[PDB]
Amino acid sequence: MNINDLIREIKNKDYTVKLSGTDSNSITQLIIRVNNDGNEYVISESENESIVEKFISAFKNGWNQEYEDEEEFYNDMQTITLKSELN
């Protein structure tokens, strides 16, 4: 678990991630672009829960929600639920 955990390994799967955030702009909205499209995905950082824990806490499950366009993406994230926990 780290930030470049998620950067490097989600980088290793064939997506693009290029976050943007530093002092004093205390926001670290990373961008995902689950399609190479205007369907980018985003998670912030706020005061209580780091973005790793926001990520795994936001993706313990599969894809089961509304949109029928992103589901394989969630399946990809399903794999990266389990790698960093047991390395």
């Binding site: 702009n25 499209d37 369907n39 998670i43 005061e47």
Partner: protein
């Protein structure tokens, strides 16, 4: 109209603001371009600029290297075809054409489907006689018979494309290839690195232990068992275990912050170790290099095992024996499966989707997934021995082409090629007449210093051509001027110092630079001999004596070696309080010990004349890597060295770069002195100074001396000046966009130049905000203090690191349960009303560190003064605090803060320090920004060279505006909306211009330029309060923000009350209107129109997603080549839309296919962009659109703002979706109530606003329902997420009686539902409300396009619905 400008520089935004004298923000009605009803918009002249960050140039460098290496590879294939052109044409004509069309379908192919041998028969017998190519390879080395031409070509054609690393140099012999000499090379590196704790590895046999197959982790403790002892987690132990292939941690090995895991097989190593290096220092990287080299030796002994018929058969027999173990092990394994389980036989062998056999071979999987899959299942099997040894030995089922092929030295392919050429020299004489060309092709290697083979057409290369023909590896020396091109490589690869331009910096391991840094550590040494009570900085007699003794003796010198081997051995002193160095030296003459170990001539190294000779040797051993130009460059020094050490000197290397140049150190001098920087480091009088004071000696010449070089010569434009900088690319993009916003900004206001330009900038941090990255450090301070004391406080109260951040409990654990001021015991449970007082109070420096704050019972235990703490306390407590000194509970700075009562009170030097900590701007790139903005604005010279500096460049620091903001409660929640940046720049202008109003007398410290040198040696009064309207002094109190207040509380409850409306004494003009400034500025920050501009972009970058997908038949795939079907060959998917074109045309409607006038959005790939610029209308008719109307072609880039009803602003994400644009106007009392609601437990101050702000939080429960009202009736106008809205309103109605703090926290998390850009998820209390976006695009056709200027002050409104 007098005015001034406030700015703020981050990495995604720049805040811009315009202020007047009374700080009223201006506002202007503006001209509207387009075709609307409104023709003027009143806008406030304040806002910010949003934009995506500026990425580095790394990925383009990597893909450039990949294209070049595939280019050279394929051209090597073309070379080998060129040699075997005719004779292969002699036998079978279309053979190479069969190799060219190996990739097509038999429909698309125009020859036989069998490439090799044409027929079916010799192909089937080819695979049966030779299953792999390695059988053919070992056949051809061990043969006497003739062979087929296309067969031999296919053999050596395999032997070119895969040649292994050139990273070894020379040939295969135990000097560079065996495990014994390289292992003992590691041993000499280890014991010769430490010089303490010498280990032995003489009688051990690492060849027998490491070479033979076993379990790796079982082998791991065995070499530990043959050495006497380090640990199973020893540094040598984890080092050699790292060298085997296990990936250990190195957290506790060096006592670092995080874990330090490294995988040599992973591609992260080549910089992750570097980030490890930055946490240990550069002295260890050679030891890690030896670890990598010995790991390569272990891998080489792993791949080569056969030694029976070793005559020219090193590799292929090992490969085919591995093939056979795969074969018979597969047969016996399958027999064990069907023998034991008739279930899961299909799940192993017919699956290719569950990490089984068929996934490891035919499917998509890897060896980790396969072994981790089979290992419990094969563990379950009844009778199965002697296969787990292959499991831990990685031996079962292992293929040929693996990732362990990166170990192979190219000499094996070389000689293995060569013996085939020896057995084939007789039969086919073309080979006999081309064999030197063949080995020349395989052994070719483009050096570092040469670079690419351009013809002046590159942007990157520098080759000069001594002859003019095709650059070919037969005759590579016939073209290259290595002297001129390599001379350019000297010039193209050096860096220029910012601190001294027009000059080349030194290498990192220069003798001159190491003298600089060893002297730069010895310049801080201020020792107390026992009996003078004086920490005296050293003399050049002393320093020169120690360098004559110790630094020419060993590298790592400790303080006991220091004071023992010098102060008692030479100077006969027992205990010397050497205050500077704690234990060890940050600098050492390691290169001195290197070359002195090599050539063994101390007279040669102590010569003042061989120094530049060693600069040549340091320079060549720094730069070049190809050994030929290594050695010829020192044939100039063929005289000095009699070739013995030159058998060794060509091997040794050095990487790095010095931060300085020789002309900055041993170049210029003080004209008053006639002394170099080396001369000052050897003679600085009684006051020996660090080099940061040698630059910043404002009395001395060196700031002027550097600064006369810091100004440019013939200056370029803006763009190259920004290219000259030093930082991230993104911060440079912030600089350029800052300059553009200043340019349009001064074009707005009457084309009148401004007066004051304030700059704030601080960024680039990744230190994880110090929530848990600090409790281990200060907890480690607790473990060091309790470690030295023994008074075990951690036996009766252990506490937790979630509650270690709060300063009360931590200060309680610091002082060993004993108060500083009164000699008493601070009780455990009464810490609530225990007081936290400062060493120096809140009128002289705003400090919240450990260095100032101490814990006590009462404020009156200190004394009775706002001055230093009372001498009835420090003289009283000179014993226990000296126990805090001896146990290192305090640093020397905090020691002299506490023992400032020895100095009586606050001196001129004291307030000199406290004033010169608030304001001294100490970032290099900030001063460069001040120079670049300085050059453009002030340009009126006079008859002299004098810049008539009309425009002041004011630079502030974040502590001043930040603590002003926190004190006067104009709070800042970073998560409400993006307006806060513009308010930050506004307050930057407030504090900066307030400083230029109140104190013009010391502008020369926070404004770049040359103002008066009148400073606080007289601007500080030597006594109490100066008289009213007659004060030549600045003030008494070192805070510069006091006159904004009403009460200046002293250390006695005393209200030092400063006048209400502040003026300046020398001017008689008002500077602070306290009666209306806070209602004025508070009215400014609550304004509902703040200019937000997300900057447009043209999307560049890669073409698409890169992972090549199998051959389906979905119609959305992009073909790899133009002759390739996306169906019948597969291809890429998901292209990158650069920008969306907006087109009016007619589609063919219905089955009748009739012209239907439509106006619809169309996305453009990057792969079609230059086609679109070359002819757009033929591109769109190629797309299937007729009656193009070119004047209505509307280029819409990414983030192009559109407007809908009720001002529903939305940003154009791409052609496929939208993003959300409108913002939030929130009253400032709501912002403050959410701030202190969020900050209730972390209020961090006096109990007056703890209780006051606490009850004030307890007042306004109404504000919460007002905020949910604002989001409610706001969100129904622009968001339109109805079910989400009912979920959060109902969920809000559920938990209304929550505890207040975390409830307000969930409100802050609820604010993400409004924000700008991408739709996000969030979690109110437990119910995580799902995100929802707008994939639609049909509404944008009926909307209001707005084009924006870069400050958003010339809007251009275009209506699409008015268009046909």
């Amino acid at each position: 109209k007098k005015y001034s400008i406030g700015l703020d520089i981050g990495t995604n935004s720049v805040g811009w603001a315009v202020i007047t004298d009374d700080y009223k923000v201006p506002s202007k009605k503006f001209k509207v371009l387009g075709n609307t009803d409104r023709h003027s918009i009143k806008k406030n002249l304040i806002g910010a600029l949003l934009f995506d960050s500026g990425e580095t140039a790394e990925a383009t460098r990597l893909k450039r290297t990949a294209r070049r290496r595939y280019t050279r590879r394929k051209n090597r294939i073309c070379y080998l075809q060129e040699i075997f052109s005719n004779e292969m044409a002699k036998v079978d004509d279309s053979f190479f054409h069969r190799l060219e069309e190996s990739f097509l379908v038999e429909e698309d192919k125009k020859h036989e489907r069998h490439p090799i041998f044409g027929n079916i028969v010799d192909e089937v017998a080819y695979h049966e006689k030779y299953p792999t190519i390695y059988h053919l390879r070992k056949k051809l080395v061990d043969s006497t018979d003739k062979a087929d031409l296309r067969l031999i070509y296919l053999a050596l054609a395999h032997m070119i494309k895969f040649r292994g690393h050139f990273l070894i140099e020379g040939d295969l012999n135990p000097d560079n290839s065996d495990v014994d000499k390289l292992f003992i090379q590691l041993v000499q590196t280890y014991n010769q690195l430490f010089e303490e704790n010498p280990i032995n590895a003489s009688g051990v046999d690492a060849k027998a232990i490491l070479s033979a197959r076993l379990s790796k982790s079982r082998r791991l403790e065995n070499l530990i068992a043959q050495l006497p002892g380090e640990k199973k987690n020893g540094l040598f132990g984890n080092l050699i275990a790292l060298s085997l292939g296990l990936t250990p941690n190195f957290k506790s090995n060096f006592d670092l912050a995080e874990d330090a895991k490294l995988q040599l097989s992973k591609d992260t190593y080549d910089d992750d170790l570097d980030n490890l290096l930055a946490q240990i220092g550069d002295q260890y990287a050679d030891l890690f290099l030896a670890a990598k080299n010995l790991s390569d030796a272990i891998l080489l002994s792993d791949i080569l095992r056969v030694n029976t018929e070793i005559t020219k058969a090193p590799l292929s027999a090992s490969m085919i024996k591995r093939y056979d173990e795969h074969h018979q092990d597969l047969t016996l394994l399958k027999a064990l499966v069907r023998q034991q389980l008739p279930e899961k036989y299909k799940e192993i062998f017919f699956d290719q989707s569950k990490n089984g056999y068929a996934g490891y071979i035919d499917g998509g999987a890897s060896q980790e997934e396969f072994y981790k899959f089979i290992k419990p299942i094969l563990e379950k099997m009844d009778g199965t021995e002697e296969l787990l040894v292959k499991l831990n030995r990685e031996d079962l089922l292992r293929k040929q082409r693996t990732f362990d092929n990166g170990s192979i030295p190219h000499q094996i392919h070389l000689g293995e090629l060569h013996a085939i050429l020896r057995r084939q020299e007789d039969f086919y004489p073309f080979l006999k007449d081309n064999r030197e060309k063949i080995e020349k092709i395989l052994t070719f290697r483009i050096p570092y210093y040469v670079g690419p083979l351009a013809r002046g057409n590159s942007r990157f290369a520098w080759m000069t051509r001594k002859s003019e023909e095709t650059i070919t590896p037969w005759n590579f020396e016939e073209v290259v001027d290595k002297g001129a091109s390599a001379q350019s490589f000297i010039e193209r690869m050096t860096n220029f110092d910012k601190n001294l331009p027009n000059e080349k910096v030194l290498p990192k391991h220069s003798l001159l630079y190491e003298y600089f840094t060893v002297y730069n550590e010895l310049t801080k040494v201020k020792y107390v001999t026992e009996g003078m009570r004086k920490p005296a900085f050293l003399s050049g007699e002393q320093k020169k004596a120690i360098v004559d003794l110790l630094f020419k003796t060993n590298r790592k010198v400790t303080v006991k070696q220091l004071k023992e081997d010098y102060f008692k051995k030479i100077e006969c002193f027992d205990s010397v309080e050497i205050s500077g160095v704690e234990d060890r030296f940050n600098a050492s003459l390691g290169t001195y010990h290197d070359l002195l170990k090599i050539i063994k001539d101390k007279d040669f190294l102590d010569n003042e004349e061989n120094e530049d000779i060693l600069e040549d040797i340091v320079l060549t051993l720094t730069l070049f890597e190809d050994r030929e130009m290594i050695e010829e460059r020192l044939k100039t020094y063929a005289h000095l060295f009699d070739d013995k050490v030159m058998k060794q000197l060509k091997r040794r290397r050095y990487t790095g770069w010095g931060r300085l140049s020789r002309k900055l150190i041993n170049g210029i001098r003080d004209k008053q002195s006639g002394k170099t920087i080396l001369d000052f480091l050897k003679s600085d009088g009684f006051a020996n100074r660090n080099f940061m004071q040698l630059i910043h000696d404002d009395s001395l010449t060196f700031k002027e001396d550097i600064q006369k070089a810091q100004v440019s010569g013939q200056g370029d434009s803006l763009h190259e000046h920004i290219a000259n900088l030093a930082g991230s690319p993104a911060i440079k993009k912030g600089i350029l966009q800052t300059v553009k916003v200043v340019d349009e900004l001064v074009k707005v206001m009457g084309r009148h130049k401004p007066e004051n330009i304030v700059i704030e900038m601080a960024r680039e941090n990744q230190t994880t905000q110090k929530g848990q990255k600090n409790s281990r450090e200060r907890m480690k301070r607790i473990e060091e203090g309790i470690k030295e004391l023994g008074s075990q406080i951690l036996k009766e109260h252990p506490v937790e690191n979630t509650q270690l951040q709060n300063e009360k409990l931590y200060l309680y654990y610091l002082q060993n349960g004993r108060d500083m001021y009164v000699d008493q015991e601070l009780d455990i449970n009464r810490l609530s009303d225990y007081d936290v007082d400062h060493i120096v109070p809140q009128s002289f420096l705003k400090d919240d560190s450990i260095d100032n704050k101490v814990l006590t019972r009462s404020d009156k235990n200190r004394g009775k003064s706002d001055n230093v703490p009372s001498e009835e306390v420090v003289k009283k407590m000179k014993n226990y605090w000296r126990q805090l000194l001896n146990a290192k509970l305090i640093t020397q700075r905090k020691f002299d803060n506490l023992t400032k009562a020895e100095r009586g009170g606050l001196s001129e030097l004291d307030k000199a320090g406290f004033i010169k900590r608030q304001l001294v701007e100490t970032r290099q790139i900030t001063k460069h920004v001040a120079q670049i903005l300085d050059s453009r604005m002030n340009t009126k010279y006079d008859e002299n060279d004098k810049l008539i500096r009309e425009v002041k460049v004011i630079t502030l620091k974040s502590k001043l505006v930040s603590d002003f903001r926190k004190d006067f409660q104009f709070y800042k929640v970073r998560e409400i909306n993006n307006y806060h940046h513009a308010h930050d720049a506004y307050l930057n202008a407030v504090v900066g211009t307030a400083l230029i109003k109140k104190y013009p007398k010391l502008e020369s410290e926070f404004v770049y330029g040359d103002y008066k040198v009148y400073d606080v040696r007289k601007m500080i009064a030597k006594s109490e309060q100066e008289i009213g309207k007659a004060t030549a002094k600045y003030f008494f109190y070192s805070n510069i923000m006091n006159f904004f207040k009403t009460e200046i509380t002293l250390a006695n409850g005393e209200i030092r009350k400063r006048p209400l409306i502040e003026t300046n004494g020398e001017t008689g003009e008002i500077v602070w209107d306290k009666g209306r400034d806070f209602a004025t500025v508070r009215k400014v920050l609550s304004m509902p129109q703040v200019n937000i501009v997300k900057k447009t972009e043209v999307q560049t970058g890669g073409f698409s997603k890169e992972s090549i997908l199998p051959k389906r038949n979905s119609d959305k795939l992009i073909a790899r080549k133009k002759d390739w079907d996306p169906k019948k060959y597969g291809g890429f998917d998901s292209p990158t839309v650069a920008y969306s074109v907006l087109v009016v045309a007619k589609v063919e409607k219905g089955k009748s296919k009739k012209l239907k006038s439509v106006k619809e959005l169309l996305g453009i790939t990057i792969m079609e962009r230059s086609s679109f610029e070359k002819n757009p209308i033929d591109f769109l008719e190629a797309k299937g659109y007729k009656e193009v109307k070119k004047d209505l072609i509307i280029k819409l880039p990414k983030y192009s703002l559109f407007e809908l009803e009720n001002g529903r602003k939305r940003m154009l994400a791409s052609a496929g979706e939208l993003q959300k644009g409108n913002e939030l106007a929130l009253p400032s009392k709501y912002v403050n109530f959410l701030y202190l609601a969020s900050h209730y437990e972390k209020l961090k101050g006096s109990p007056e606003d703890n209780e006051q702000k606490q009850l004030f939080v307890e007042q306004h429960k109404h504000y919460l329902d007002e905020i949910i009202e604002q989001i409610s009736e706001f969100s129904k106008r622009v968001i339109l997420a109805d079910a989400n809205l009912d979920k959060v309103l109902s969920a809000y109605n559920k938990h209304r009686d929550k505890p207040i703090r975390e409830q307000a926290e969930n409100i802050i998390h609820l604010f993400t539902l409004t924000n700008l850009g991408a739709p996000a998820a969030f979690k109110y209390f437990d119910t995580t409300i799902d995100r929802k976006r707008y994939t639609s695009t049909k509404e944008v056709l009926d909307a209001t396009l707005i084009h924006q200027s870069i400050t958003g002050l010339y809007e251009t409104r275009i209506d699409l619905s008015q268009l046909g």
